[PDB]
From TrEMBL:
It comes from Nitrosopumilus maritimus (strain SCM1). It comes from the Archaea. This is peptidylprolyl isomerase. Its EC number is 5.2.1.8. Keywords: Isomerase, Rotamase, Signal.
Length: 93
């Protein structure tokens, strides 16, 4: 059907070793929020485990929204280096 919005998260870091670790750490069987509540330097994200819930095109930045919905159901996005840093978008649906 018509998919306007979708569930996804986000995590901001200062080093790629941290952002990229979001796809490696969880690989063991951890929780995304477990890293979003720490790594996420964004004051307005670490409080919600980087879980922004449902979003759409126009509620985020270019270097984020683009690869924010291009992911699959439960897939992690690459460390997109932006003005805020590496963005780790992860869909949850």
């Amino acid at each position: 059907g018509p998919s306007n919005k979708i569930k996804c998260s986000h995590i901001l870091v200062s080093k790629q070793s941290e952002a990229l670790a979001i796809m490696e750490k969880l690989k063991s069987g951890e929780k995304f929020g477990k890293l979003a509540k720490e790594l996420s330097i964004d004051s307005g994200s670490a409080k919600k485990n980087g879980n922004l819930g449902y979003f759409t095109k126009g509620m985020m930045v270019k270097p984020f929204e683009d690869a924010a919905f291009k992911l699959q159901v439960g897939e992690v996005s690459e460390p997109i280096k932006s003005e805020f840093g590496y963005h780790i978008i992860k869909r949850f649906g």
